[PDB]
């Protein structure tokens, strides 16, 4: 009944091939990158942080926030499987469940309702919905949540820029572009409040 | 003896240390550059692992090469290597951040000028040698078998974005104030006649001073790099628990 | 799972026993003419069990010896050696296909 | 224990095998030329045994060499 | 170690070779009266041995003369005769030499087949996994 | 005389080879991808949602909206084929029929008219046209439909952009860039209108 | 004289290897490919039609526009060949003539004149030039003809961009990018004119 | 004390083990390279 | 002493292996590709001419300009070798001499001086250097010549780009992209000047 | 000594490691990296192409390392063909000329770092083992190639900054400076005879 | 120690091996054609020994060529 | 210089000549008892030269015929047939290797 | 090293000597009846030295007026021994190239 | 045109005919002792032509001994031996046609 060693290896290599998809569609990678995309866009820098470090910080942030779920998968699924306590079929299910639970904690009821009706299936409990339908609902909630956080992050930088523009216009110099003057002020206020540490607390802790 | 034990151990005792070494190289500033071919980088990783082999302690024999536990070992060797590599990328891109903030404030590619010079700083200060010394030390204090980056290491590495802005602003605070005060002084002094304005005339004036200020920035940039490297090196040792 | 034992099965221990049996059978053929030498037999089931986790059997002659005392029936020894070689070839094919399938799965080729 | 000890142990295993194969090849060569020159103390059976073992020993050497080269050729075609 | 069958089959080839040489000497000296009555040729026979302390090699433990009494012949004409005109001849029996010739040749060639087939098994082992 | 087993396998392996072509030309993937592309460019974000996430969302959406035709293929062409009830040639036709019907429901008669004349075949009824003619007509209709939906979603973001620029020009701060201030309002409108759930629901309901 | 069966297979299998080359050099694939790229550049979207879709439409259209040539190849070459009415030599020459006639009809004299003088051959009439001197000339003319058609399509979208840019500048907002504002109107112009049917019909009709 | 069966099994086990670790290393690196080359 | 037939077959079968190296190093294929590569970058289109079409035209061009050297090889080396007039080595030398004359004709002295000194051999006349030291000197000369030609062709398009960008700044619309509003004029200039014929003619002319 | 059958197998096997020897022991590494860096310096991305870059490096690494090949031939190849030396001694006789060349073309600091990492006690630089000299050689050659290459980058970066500032002076903020700088980047390289200048210095750089 | 000097030296080394292979093949062919034409003073052993030598010599020539061509392709096709 | 005449040498002609010699010898063995039949012989040197660049002789008897006029020495004919058969096979091995050597040079394997 | 002289050993010369020895024995058997012919023997060590001769055989029995010193019992045995050893030399020398080719081709 | 009738030639039919000729010779050898049996032959030229585009009696060299059987056993052995040799050649020719045909469609 249990999959043979040859077939289990084939399944293992298959999931490694789809590993980039699982990061950007099932884990918290999508929300972090979108929020960090807003932060780069909000400040006057266009490509200054560069794409490489943002993804690298996002990957490390995901491993931080996915550590509880990854450890739960390790304990429940990997440990019985390594010790040959359980078969491969049930070990795979034991690993799938923590991922499903985490995606439910970061989704909305309205999003699930739309896709479960879209799939044209019958279900009564959100806890046993297929992962094929949970994934589109999860990322849709993630994109909406990220836009909410990004909108809140965009407001203080908009506040600073509007104040500087008003001050320059009030002083009479209708000739100077507000962006050049406002950029150091936005950066200074981003540093002396330790903005990134605050963003870490409101982003890593946003999942719970 | 049964020859299986001898052959399997060497592959386990070589490839697993090599994976961590190779993973650091592909993310490293110099060895992970686009100029070098993968083949040259591959041979460099092979040669480094062979040479530093005596200093690497023997891996535990409990974990088998063909087992899921051995598969996890390969992944966690890469994570350690990428951790060191990303730190080096963080420093250089922070100088790229320093170049672009000056260029943006200069009414204006200037990041490349700082990126190239910072790469020279990395090479001249033997930064590549120190990183290689760090990864071999990682084998001692962070053994291959038992050990991996914890959650705290991920959060410390994720918090380096604030390190970028604070360090970049600290380097440019004196220059950026100079850029603002001359532009504000130019604005107020020419505000008497609204016929002149600045527009493109202000573009020319701003960029000439901005290039001149970058000349001042390069005059005292080395001291900032030395302090920055100490912060980065301390973070790396924290990852490897040294 | 995903281990060489669970993957190769008993086709690795069987090969060693089949080579052991061929050494025993060849010994009887060589020692056929030695007087007083008693033919040696090997139990495959016991040897396979010992190989998987880890005594002298003699073969009863079909006819009395002509005085020398040697109980080696060279007609039977050749027949058993021929059978042992065929089953050993199958075991190599069985064991060889275990590695080929493992390599095929780990590389998708 | 260090990784050099495992590497040295692997190196000595290969050196021992090569010497064993070389010993058989030289042993077969002497027995072949001893019987070929006309020495009456050498039996054709021992000569055929000697060259049978040397041929099998060298064939094992070829198989190990090809696997080592194939692994190296596989190794050089990897993302890095 | 890797060629245990060869050492046993090869030992049989060397062992059965000696028995044929001994048979040839017995037939070539079946009519050699020689001199005296104690220096007369006697049928020689090899002794096979197996030390069973895997594989048990066959070792020749020396040539042993037959215990059969010498064949006496009355011939008071041969100058090498004795007081009663008797010349003692080797105790070689042709029928037992013919049987040894048949037994030695067939057993020798049987071990050739085993040794030749043993090499095939070794060659097939090298093809494992290919 | 159905195709031999060796030829049947050879045909199926060829269809898997053209699987990207079938998805990107014969399915709903193209229209969803284009509409998402227009929406992303409509806002100030260049590639914040990222290309992999956009395609990942579209792949799940195009699988859900085509579940009815996928089931119809299974219930009329796969199960009879596996139960040894239909000739393999018949089963291939039974699978192609629902796919052709679905593509005809989302095509424009003008697209069929130009391609039928282009192919130069004398066919009158708009149901027995070849797949060689139907597929280019279908993909052309999907591109035009996506542009119409893309323009529809673009207008509210154009309204915000013009209002912000007009208000800034009213105060005389012409030097201030309207795009930096407009973006948080574009995120604001899209999130309190529940845009992500709304657009994916409309795209799902569009194919009918 | 007649090539052996083994040689005929070798020649035929050789032409399958050069099939991609003949598509992009000796057919209508290149001109249609270039025009869509220019048309895509004219509109604000740079990767919305998608390379795979554009090549897919180009492959379908080049099948429709080369059908008269392919049918002539079938009738003149293949049918006498399969019925053993002509040798392998005659069949290949009979197949080349309709393909050469198609390329001669779409070429330019000056392009033919340029390569004829370069090849150093004595040619009396264009309708008998060598194949090696026609292929570079045919692809040269197709590229030039593609640019002319692309310039025609670029102007209407350029006019819209210029119109909207000047209107925004008149109202005093010199910081709002006209590209964002112009994009909805660029899409609409391509819609109510039925661009995806008009452009393709003209491209197909450009070879008649 | 050793035979050709042990040598061949040792050779095959080493080849399978080496091929296993190389491919998994390749898969993880390709996954890393895909993540790095994405539009932020 | 002429080589055996087996060695001669093995010797010229190795030439086929090194055939791609000869084209990219010892022939005119290098310069033609570079000039058309720079020409493509001069116009706004990024990859419209495509790499395969660029290589295809280059292969036809390098075949037409190397015909005299190929004819000389056949009429000096191949024909005597087939007719048993000279041996294998004499045929090899007779084939190399026209090839060396072509590389030396289109090379630079300083490039020859640079490489003869590094190699460390006595030179008194240009026609004494070994092919090992002529190949790297020839390709260096071709790259410099190709860059010079590319620079000339780039200038007229640079003038158009400067004019159109300056005119837009004259009206004051800085945000409008010059690149989009300059592509139709860059393409049209390449049309009415008929670039695809004279540029290829100059490349053919430059080698002779 | 090894049997004839075995020593034929030995040379045949290492005959396939010839690309490996070139990349990490001879001057192929430095030239390719400098060529790659200079290729990225101009606006052209793959105009020189990889094959032409390699072909120039292969010719350069033969002319520059020609003294190394001369010593190996006369000290190892010639004695072996005259039966004046055995297989192992001939192989060792070839390592010494190549180990000397690699030792003199590395940096002290890198060798000091590597001997510490290798954990072997060696009192003088000229007695280090080849196992630790090979990684030290390529690590130092990489630093040299990067330092040489980026200095060549500087004049082409000067042109970019000049043209970009000039375009920004007139308010033409939307015109991309890279397309304008590309014709002038090529002209600078051809006016200074770049393809001869870099190769002459690269050839003379080694010892 | 000049580039032309070493280039000639390795060319001399390379052309010597090619001439050695050519000598074995010509000698093998000469022995075959004399025995085949009916010359009495030619033994089949000399014919068979020579043609076995040529086969081994030519086999080495092909194998060495394959190593060099593969090595050349490896260096040219590397992802610089 | 690469041509079949140069590559195959004289072995492409020797096989046909030795086949002709076998026919001439065989018809002498078959016609051994026919009176008035003179044993025929084929000169190898002349026949090979004729084949190379584009009429069987009579064999002199060692002893007089016994009154039938037939000069076939069946003792000698068997010896020549055996020699020709061995030399025919040797030419086949020589000619066969000529094509195999060409094939491995062309295919590189 | 690595030369055919060392790769083939002395097996390249033994085949020739066994052919010469077979020729001499064939001569002795044919000339057994011709009176005055003296049996010729070949010394193996002489051709061994020639590699790195044609002697006379002293009779064991007197002639019978012919002067022919050929013993047909001896010649048959010496021809049988030479033929058996000749095949072994072919096997030895033949396997020298078979091993040599396997080393070069690796297969 | 490319077809098996033009690619295989007559070798596809020749193999079959020689198998029939084997049966005809075989039934002659078996019936050697049966009185009243007349040895029958097969005309290869006529049979091959019939197969391509779609049992004669052998004359005795000597009178029968009285049984009525005209089977010459030594002739049958000679004919069977030749037929078996040419049958192997026919298989060699026909088999090589497919192998050369496969090499063309595969390119190696």
| Chain I: partners with 3+ C-beta pairs within 8 Å | G, J, K, L
Quick one: tokens of E21? Answer: 């040489």
Give burial (CB, 10 Å; 0-12/13-18/19+) of G104: middle
Quick one: tokens of F27? Answer: 């399915």
* Distance (Å, whole) CA D65 – CA D62: 5
Chain D 4-63, CB below 8 Å of chain H: which residues? 56, 60, 63
Chain I 122-181, CB below 8 Å of chain K: which residues? 130, 132-133
Contacting C with CB below 8 Å, chain H residues are: 3, 5-6, 9, 12-13, 15-16, 19-20, 23
Backbone angles phi, psi at M70, to 5 degrees: -100, 125
* Distance (Å, whole) CA I156 – CA B139: 61
**How far does I85 lie from chain K, in Å, by closest CA?**
21
**b (16+ CB within 10 A) / e for C38-71:** bbbebeeeebeeebeeeeeeebeeeeeeeeeebb
What is the resolution of the experimental data for this entry, in Å? 3.2
Give burial (CB, 10 Å; 0-12/13-18/19+) of B61: middle
Q: Are strands E44-50 and E58-65 parallel, antiparallel or unpaired?
A: antiparallel
**DSSP secondary structure string for all residues of I138-159:** HHHHHHHHHHHHHHHHHHHHHH
Tell me which residue of D73, E54, J86 sits closest to M2, measured CA to CA.
J86
Tell me which residue of F177, F176, F199 sits closest to F189, measured CA to CA.
F199
* Distance (Å, whole) CA J124 – CA J113: 14
L44/K contact by beta carbon, under 8 A: yes
**b (16+ CB within 10 A) / e for F146-176:** bbebbbebbeebbebbbebbeebbeeebbbb
- The alpha carbons of chain C give a radius of gyration, in whole angstroms, of 18
> Are residues G184 and G174 in contact, defined by beta-carbon separation less than 8 angstroms?
no
> Are residues J147 and B83 in contact, defined by beta-carbon separation less than 8 angstroms?
no
List of E strands, chain L = 40-41, 57-58
* Distance (Å, whole) CA F147 – CA F34: 8
Query: Cα angle at I89 between I88 and I91, to 5 degrees?
Result: 65
Backbone angles phi, psi at C40, to 5 degrees: -105, 130
Which chain K residue is nearest to residue B40, measuring alpha carbons?
A: K80
Quick one: tokens of B190? Answer: 């020419």
Give burial (CB, 10 Å; 0-12/13-18/19+) of J145: buried
* Distance (Å, whole) CA I187 – CA I190: 5
Length of chain G: 208
Contacting D with CB below 8 Å, chain B residues are: 3, 6-7, 9-10, 13-14, 17, 22, 25-26, 38-39, 41-42, 45, 53-59
Element (H, E) at M40: strand M40-41
Residues in chain H within 8 Å Cβ distance of A20: 31, 34-35
Candidate from B50, B129, B199 with C-beta closest to J113: B129
Q: Are strands C40-41 and C57-58 parallel, antiparallel or unpaired?
A: antiparallel
Pairwise CB contact (< 8 Å): K56 & M97:
yes
Tell me which residue of C37, C46, C70, C77 sits closest to E52, measured CA to CA.
C37
* Distance (Å, whole) CA E15 – CA E61: 10
G191/F contact by beta carbon, under 8 A: yes
Backbone angles phi, psi at N16, to 5 degrees: -65, -40
Distances (CA, A) of N107 to G16, M80, N92: 12, 54, 22
Residues in chain D within 8 Å Cβ distance of J2: 18, 22
Distances (CA, A) of A187 to A104, A190, B166, B172: 37, 5, 9, 11
Pairwise CB contact (< 8 Å): D60 & H7:
yes
What SS3 class is residue B174? helix
* Distance (Å, whole) CA F21 – CA F39: 25
Chain-centroid distance of CA H38 in Å reads: 27
Give burial (CB, 10 Å; 0-12/13-18/19+) of F54: middle
Residues in chain L within 8 Å Cβ distance of I13: 105-106, 108
* Distance (Å, whole) CA G56 – CA G200: 13
* Distance (Å, whole) CA J32 – CA K12: 29
The label of the residue with tokens 């002539």 reads G72
Pairwise CB contact (< 8 Å): A6 & C3:
no
Candidate from D6, D13, D80 with C-beta closest to B3: D13
Query: Cα angle at B60 between B55 and B62, to 5 degrees?
Result: 165
Pairwise CB contact (< 8 Å): I64 & G115:
yes
Experimental technique: cryo-EM
* Distance (Å, whole) CA B133 – CA B130: 5
Residues in chain A within 8 Å Cβ distance of B179: 180
Quick one: tokens of D71? Answer: 């692994």
Quick one: tokens of B42? Answer: 């591959």
Query: Cα angle at D51 between D45 and D53, to 5 degrees?
Result: 100
* Distance (Å, whole) CA N67 – CA A139: 101
Pinpoint the alpha helices (H) of D1-80.
3-37, 44-76
**How far does D43 lie from chain J, in Å, by closest CA?**
23
**Residue F95 per-residue DSSP state:** H
**How far does E13 lie from chain D, in Å, by closest CA?**
6
E128/D contact by beta carbon, under 8 A: no
Residues in chain C within 8 Å Cβ distance of E9: 26, 29-30
What SS3 class is residue L70? coil
Tell me which residue of C52, C48, C46, C57 sits closest to C24, measured CA to CA.
C57
Pairwise CB contact (< 8 Å): D69 & J9:
no
Which chain A residue is nearest to residue H23, measuring alpha carbons?
A: A13
Pairwise CB contact (< 8 Å): E128 & H9:
yes
J198/B contact by beta carbon, under 8 A: no
> Are residues A203 and A35 in contact, defined by beta-carbon separation less than 8 angstroms?
yes
Distances (CA, A) of A40 to A150, F20, H9, I204: 10, 35, 57, 52
G202/F contact by beta carbon, under 8 A: no
> Are residues L22 and L84 in contact, defined by beta-carbon separation less than 8 angstroms?
yes
Pairwise CB contact (< 8 Å): J9 & D61:
yes
Pinpoint the alpha helices (H) of M1-107.
4-8, 11-30, 44-51, 72-105
> Are residues B19 and B78 in contact, defined by beta-carbon separation less than 8 angstroms?
yes
Length of chain F: 208
Please give the torsion angle defined by the CA atoms of residues G173, G177, G181 and G185, in that order, rounded to the nearest 10 degrees: 120
Candidate from B157, B166, B198 with C-beta closest to A175: B198
Candidate from F45, F53, F175 with C-beta closest to A139: F53
Tell me which residue of C34, C44, C46 sits closest to C80, measured CA to CA.
C44
Contacting A with CB below 8 Å, chain C residues are: 1-3, 6-7, 101-102, 104-106, 108
* Distance (Å, whole) CA A32 – CA A46: 18
**How far does G47 lie from chain I, in Å, by closest CA?**
13
- The alpha carbons of chain J give a radius of gyration, in whole angstroms, of 23
Pairwise CB contact (< 8 Å): K43 & M12:
no
**How far does J201 lie from chain I, in Å, by closest CA?**
11
* Distance (Å, whole) CA A70 – CA F164: 46
Residues in chain A within 8 Å Cβ distance of H27: 13, 16-17, 19
Candidate from I9, I87, I88 with C-beta closest to L105: I9
Pairwise CB contact (< 8 Å): K56 & M100:
yes
Element (H, E) at E59: strand E58-65
Number of residue pairs across D and J with CB atoms under 8 Å? Answer: 20
> Are residues K58 and J14 in contact, defined by beta-carbon separation less than 8 angstroms?
no
């Amino acid at each position: 009944e249990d999959y043979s060693v040859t077939l289990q290896i084939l399944a293992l290599m298959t999931m490694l091939g789809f590993l980039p998809a699982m990061v950007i569609l099932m884990t918290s990678f999508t929300r972090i990158v979108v929020v960090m995309s807003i932060l780069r866009q909000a400040m006057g820098l266009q490509q200054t942080p560069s794409n490489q470090v943002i993804i690298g910080i996002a990957l490390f942030l995901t491993f931080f926030v996915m550590s509880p779920v990854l450890n739960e998968i390790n304990d429940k699924a990997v440990q019985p499987y390594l010790n040959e306590q359980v078969t491969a079929r049930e070990a795979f299910d034991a690993a799938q469940a923590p991922m499903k639970a985490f995606m439910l904690k970061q989704t909305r009821i309205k999003d699930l309702e739309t896709f479960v009706t879209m799939s044209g299936e019958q279900v009564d409990n959100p806890e046993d919905v297929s992962m094929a339908v949970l994934i589109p609902a999860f990322i849709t909630s993630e994109l909406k949540t990220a836009f909410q956080i990004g909108f809140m992050l965009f407001l203080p930088f908009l506040i600073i820029d509007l104040v500087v523009a008003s001050v320059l216009m009030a002083m009479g110099m209708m000739m100077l572009s507000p962006m050049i003057v406002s950029l150091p002020f936005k950066l200074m206020l981003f540093v002396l409040v330790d903005g990134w540490n605050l963003i870490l607390s409101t982003l890593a802790g946003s999942f719970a | 003896e049964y020859p299986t034990s001898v052959v399997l151990d060497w592959i386990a005792n070589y490839f697993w240390p090599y994976v961590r070494i190779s993973s650091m190289l592909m993310v490293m500033t110099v060895t992970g550059a686009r100029f070098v071919s993968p083949r040259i980088r591959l041979y460099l990783g092979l040669a480094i692992t062979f040479a530093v082999m005596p200093a690497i302690p023997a891996v535990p024999q409990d974990i088998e090469l063909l087992s899921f536990r051995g598969f996890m070992t390969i992944a966690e060797q890469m994570i350690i290597g990428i951790a060191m590599g990303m730190v080096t990328q963080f420093m250089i891109q922070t100088f790229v951040l320093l170049g672009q903030i000056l260029g943006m404030q200069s009414s204006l590619l200037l990041g490349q000028l700082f990126m190239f010079l910072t790469t020279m700083f990395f090479l001249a200060t033997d930064g590549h040698l120190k990183m290689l010394q760090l990864v071999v030390f990682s084998f001692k204090t962070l053994p291959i078998g038992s050990g991996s980056l914890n959650a705290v290491d991920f959060r410390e590495m994720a918090g380096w974005l604030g390190i970028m802005f604070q360090t970049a602003l600290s380097m440019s605070l004196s220059g950026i104030i100079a850029l603002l005060t001359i532009n504000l002084s130019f604005g107020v002094m020419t505000r008497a006649a609204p016929q002149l304005n600045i527009f493109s005339l202000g573009f020319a004036f701003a960029l000439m001073v901005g290039l001149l200020l970058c000349w001042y920035i390069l005059a005292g940039l080395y001291s900032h790099y030395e302090m920055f490297w100490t912060v980065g090196e301390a973070q790396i040792c924290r990852l490897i628990r040294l | 799972a995903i281990s060489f034992d669970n993957a190769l099965g008993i086709h690795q221990h069987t090969v060693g026993v089949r080579e052991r049996n061929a050494e025993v059978i060849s010994t009887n053929i060589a020692q056929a003419n030695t007087p007083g030498y008693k033919a040696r037999g090997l139990d495959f089931a016991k040897e396979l069990q010992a190989a998987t986790s880890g005594d002298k059997l003699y073969r009863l002659p079909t006819q009395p010896d002509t005085g020398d005392g040697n109980t080696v029936d060279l007609d039977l020894e050749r027949n058993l050696f021929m059978q042992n070689q065929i089953r050993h070839q199958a075991s190599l094919d069985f064991l060889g296909s275990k590695f080929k399938n493992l390599t095929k799965a780990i590389k998708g080729e | 224990a260090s990784g050099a000890k495992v590497g040295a142990d692997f190196n000595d295993l290969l050196t021992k095998a090569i010497n064993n194969v070389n010993t058989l090849q030289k042993a077969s060569g002497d027995l072949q030329t001893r019987f070929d020159r006309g020495d009456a103390d050498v039996s054709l059976s021992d000569v055929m045994i000697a060259r049978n073992k040397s041929s099998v020993a060298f064939d094992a050497t070829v198989q190990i060499r090809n696997k080592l080269v194939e692994a190296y050729k596989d190794l050089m075609n990897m993302p890095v | 170690s890797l060629f245990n069958v060869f050492n046993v089959t090869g030992s049989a080839m060397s062992a059965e070779s000696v028995r044929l040489n001994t048979t040839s000497s017995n037939l070539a000296n079946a009519d050699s009266v020689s001199s005296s009555a104690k220096d007369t040729y006697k049928a020689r026979h090899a002794v096979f041995g197996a030390e069973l302390s895997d594989t048990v090699p066959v070792k020749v433990m020396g040539i042993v003369e037959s215990d059969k009494p010498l064949s006496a012949e009355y011939n008071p004409d041969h100058p090498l005769a004795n007081e009663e005109g008797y010349i003692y001849k080797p105790n070689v029996n042709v029928m037992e030499e013919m049987a040894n010739m048949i037994s030695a040749s067939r057993a020798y060639q049987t071990n050739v087949q085993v040794a030749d087939s043993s090499k095939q098994m070794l060659l097939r082992t090298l093809q494992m996994g290919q």
